[PDB]
Design a protein around this ligand. Sequence first.
Ligand SMILES: [N+]
Lengths: 30, 30, 30, 29, 30, 30
Amino acid sequence: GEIAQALKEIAKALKEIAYALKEIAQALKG
Amino acid sequence: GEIAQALKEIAKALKEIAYALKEIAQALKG
Amino acid sequence: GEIAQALKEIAKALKEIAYALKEIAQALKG
Amino acid sequence: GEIAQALKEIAKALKEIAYALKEIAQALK
Amino acid sequence: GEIAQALKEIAKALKEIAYALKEIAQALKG
Amino acid sequence: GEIAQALKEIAKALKEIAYALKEIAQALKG
Ligand SMILES: [N+]
């Protein structure tokens, strides 16, 4: 249903954010 | 089903965010 | 059940996020 | 309905966010 | 009504995260 | 009700992340 779909799309967004922040972690460590 | 999967993907995403943010804490503190 | 477990993992994840962000706040302000 | 509207706004938001994060990936890599 | 509000707040939060990470990307490039 | 609460707590967490990351942006612009 609609809630299932909403949350699947949110899951995807947060997984890309995980990735972005892991790249930032590395960049700042030097 | 679909709800179980949605929430399991949110669990995974949020656990990677916990990790990423702790690596940021470390980077910024030295 | 799968939903019960999913929600327990969300609870846990958000407690680690709360903490991580406290550490970030502190790094930057002090 | 309220959920119908929420999801219409969410689709748009997430398409912009997808792109933003693609630009971030590229900047760093 | 509670779920409608939850989802609206997620949408907004993720747009602010997108922005913050664009600013971080730029800082580290420059 | 448990899902509604989970997502309300996610909204809160992600709003605090927005804050943290905007403070990082500023710190690194230095
Ligand atoms: N729900």
